[PDB]
Amino acid sequence: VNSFSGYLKLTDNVYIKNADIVEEAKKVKPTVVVNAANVYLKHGGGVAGALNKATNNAMQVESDDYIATNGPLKVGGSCVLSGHNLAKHCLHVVGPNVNKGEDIQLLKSAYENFNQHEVLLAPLLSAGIFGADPIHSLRVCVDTVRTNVYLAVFDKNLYDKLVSSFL
Numbered sequence: 001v002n003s004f005s006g007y008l009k010l011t012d013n014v015y016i017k018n019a020d021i022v023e024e025a026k027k028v029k030p031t032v033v034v035n036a037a038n039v040y041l042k043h044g045g046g047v048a049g050a051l052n053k054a055t056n057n058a059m060q061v062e063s064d065d066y067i068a069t070n071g072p073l074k075v076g077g078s079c080v081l082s083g084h085n086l087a088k089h090c091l092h093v094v095g096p097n098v099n100k101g102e103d104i105q106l107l108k109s110a111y112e113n114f115n116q117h118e119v120l121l122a123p124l125l126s127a128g129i130f131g132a133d134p135i136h137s138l139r140v141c142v143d144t145v146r147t148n149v150y151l152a153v154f155d156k157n158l159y160d161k162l163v164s165s166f167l
């Protein structure tokens with residue numbers, strides 16, 4: 001039993017809700033919240049900008065130190081950093097950005113990072129400003145992640161489309 005409330009169950013291990021991931025994280029304090037990061041951990045907009053803003057920019061400060069030490073992530077890769085006031089940990093995962101021409105096949109590799117964590121609160125990778133089809137992203141998530149994933153979808157309209165078209 002865990003503290004996630006109001007989710008619709010899609011499969012044995014994947015759950016979905018219409019929610020703001022910032023507010024969902026603030027209330028649940030999950031062990032892991034996933035950020036839709038870029039390789040530079042520049043959290044300017046989308047989910048990343050919203051998560052970072054909710055941390056009063058502490059996420060960005062920590063991220064800049066991480067990059068200065070380690071260099072950029074790989075597309076499809078991840079790193080574990082602090083969850084600040086939102087979660088114990090933040091798993092920064094880089095899905096391919098279609099608006100940069102990145103290979104969508106890397107979306108599966110991105111979701112594989114979730115399997116290193118028993119339970120996660122996460123957005124749909126490569127959705128939103130990353131330009132991928134959220135329905136495809138959900139399919140890859142379901143077919144790749146084996147651990148327990150609670151997906152937060154900000155837009156009510158897209159949420160309904162994702163549920164209604166789910167196979």
Ligand SMILES: Nc1nc(N2CC3(CCC3)[C@@](F)(C(=O)O)C2)c2c(n1)[nH]c1cc(F)ccc12
Nearest residue numbers: 020021022046047050127128129152153154155
């Ligand atoms: N550009 C942008 N995309 C965001 N996504 C990307 C998205 C996937 C489909 C498009 C999303 F809309 C959704 O799940 O419906 C969330 C958020 C955001 N800005 N600010 C936010 C603040 C939050 F608390 C949570 C999510 C976002």
